[PDB]
Ligand SMILES: Nc1ncnc2c1ncn2[C@@H]1O[C@H](COP(=O)(O)OP(=O)(O)O)[C@@H](O)[C@H]1O
Ligand SMILES: Nc1ncnc2c1ncn2[C@@H]1O[C@H](COP(=O)(O)OP(=O)(O)O)[C@@H](O)[C@H]1O
Ligand SMILES: CC(C)(CO)[C@@H](O)C(=O)NCCC(=O)O
Ligand SMILES: CC(C)(CO)[C@@H](O)C(=O)NCCC(=O)O
Ligand code: NA
Ligand code: NA
Ligand code: NA
């Protein structure tokens with residue numbers, strides 16, 4: 001039966017790497033991974049390099065499209081010092097490691113002949129402040145589609161891809177568990193913009209951010225494996241993030257492995273799992289590329305959208 | 308404020324026509340319009356020709372994209388006697404005249420240097436049979452997303468764009484108000500496929516037909532104007548379609564203008580309007596191009612998606 005996709009396994013996928021050069025040390029790679037992520041240079045070669053290649057082959061082809069319309073409209077060409085920004089979306093569950101995938105991808109792309117300005121933005125900064133979430137009675141739905149100012153988010157990405165000289169985005173603090181007053185991330189006509197978030201790949205009755213993606217990734221893995229990673233990381237943060245007297249979660253630092261496991265599981269069960277099942281997973285079918293990880297966090301299978 | 312769209316009016320739009328040649332008579336145009344549609348050659352020049360142009364500028368650019376991926380995958384090029392079919396979607400309310408727009412567009416495109424095989428398919432043939440609709444208790448929701456075998460529909464379009472030599476689709480009879488037993492429409496590796504239907508532009512938790520469109524149209528107009536056209540056409544069919552002793556609607560032929568108006572309005576109010584408001588309209592934001600018609604059925608404004 002015909003299919004819009006093409007499946008792979010490491011063996012098959014690594015061959016699509018070609019001459020694609022490695023321009024990252026085992027050290028730089030380290031400052032790019034999050035607590036719990038395993039990514040090593042091998043994986044960056046057999047997985048992230050082919051990906052980088054494909055993305056590069058597309059940025060060109062994708063440019064033709066905006067040019068065609070530009071030509072149709074009889075517009076004054078298109079300054080190469082400012083093409084239509086290539087937007088890339090990275091979606092997936094909480095704790096699946098999309099922040100690592102996004103960081104590595106960014107580094108790989110910024111390191112390409114001519115040094116493309118490659119900006120990265122997470123949707124965290126588009127969550128409503130805690131005060132506003134409390135007002136809407138959503139302090140326990142952080143991460144759900146409605147906990148986000150999707151209008152501001154859409155406005156942001158639209159601004160950037162429309163060619164704006166610069167756009168601003170609020171900043172989220174994981175330390176304080178809330179939006180930072182007066183903080184902002186300024187993005188200047190990037191060549192590539194990577195938007196990382198839980199629900200970035202979703203659709204609706206209004207034009208959305210996913211309707212502006214030229215390429216998208218969905219970091220996937222088994223729900224039981226991800227819960228495993230979540231709980232695991234929760235216990236591990238008792239001595240990293242939670243250890244800080246300022247962490248909005250400082251009281252967890254003192255929990256016993258047992259107490260911690262109970263607490264972590266409760267959050268997963270009441271917040272992150274429901275959201276994964278009801279909102280995130282239903283968006284996976286549209287990802288240009290799905291990166292399937294195994295219990296060890298390694299990407300061993302990939303699903304590509306050829307159609 | 309930046310926008311993904313660009314608005315136009317006839318004046319502005321007709322200028323984008325350029326050398327685009329007219330290859331249709333006032334006679335051929337006639338056998339292409341439906342009861343109630345006004346389209347004349349002027350409109351075909353000031354509106355449909357620019358459209359044809361844009362579409363042509365895109366088919367090329369769009370080809371680069373599949374080639375890029377083909378190249379990425381190290382595939383044996385791509386025979387010009389069989390490129391990736393260009394899929395075009397035409398959506399809109401019942402009675403808004405999308406069947407005319409689809410027919411005219413098809414004719415215009417088939418009449419292009421090298422004579423592209425341009426096939427046209429409506430979603431009518433993907434409705435469940437009346438027997439099956441009665442079973443699901445949906446005999447009064449014909450046209451709603453659930454009255455369609457979306458799996459078969461998706462399979463069909465996927466088959467065609469995936470390069471299949473030929474694909475089949477059931478055939479709907481407006482005369483009998485049901486699917487025709489054993490009837491089928493065979494489509495052979497077209498260069499362009501136009502898919503016309505009510506809900507063709509919608510999304511969901513599964514990859515859909517709208518995810519395969521390379522270009523899409525949304526024939527729009529005011530809901531009161533469309534109801535007007537609907538009722539109007541209903542009365543007019545008393546002596547055309549309904550007049551046939553076989554029409555599943557033959558009893559309406561004998562209605563008085565008054566009775567007819569009452570009946571028509573009831574259907575609009577209980578079926579076609581709800582579906583337009585709940586399912587069709589929410590899809591308009593994604594149309595590559597929106598053709599806005601006035602009470603007289605003429606397209607006087609257009610909204611294009613540049614992003
Ligand atoms: N409570 C927390 N305190 C500090 N840092 C956190 C906390 N929760 C998550 N983080 C970090 O911020 C990012 C959150 O990742 P998550 O939201 O789990 O998405 P993912 O792991 O798929 O990138 C990761 O770097 C994670 O390690
Ligand atoms: N009851 C009917 N009997 C015969 N033909 C019909 C009937 N209803 C609609 N048609 C015709 O079949 C097509 C249905 O169009 P509709 O389903 O109203 O979409 P649109 O008018 O936007 O193309 C049009 O050609 C219409 O004239
Ligand atoms: C950024 C948060 C809070 C939400 O996006 C999430 O990434 C997280 O790390 N843990 C889930 C806890 C919560 O969502 O309340
Ligand atoms: C093809 C139908 C029936 C539905 O697609 C519709 O186009 C129509 O012409 N009139 C609405 C009547 C009904 O949908 O039952
Ligand atoms: Na941010
Ligand atoms: Na997308
Ligand atoms: Na690994």
Ligand code: NA
Nearest residue numbers: 429432477478
């Ligand atoms: Na059909």
Ligand code: NA
Nearest residue numbers: 517518520523
């Ligand atoms: Na579409």
Ligand code: NA
Nearest residue numbers: 345346350605
């Ligand atoms: Na007209």
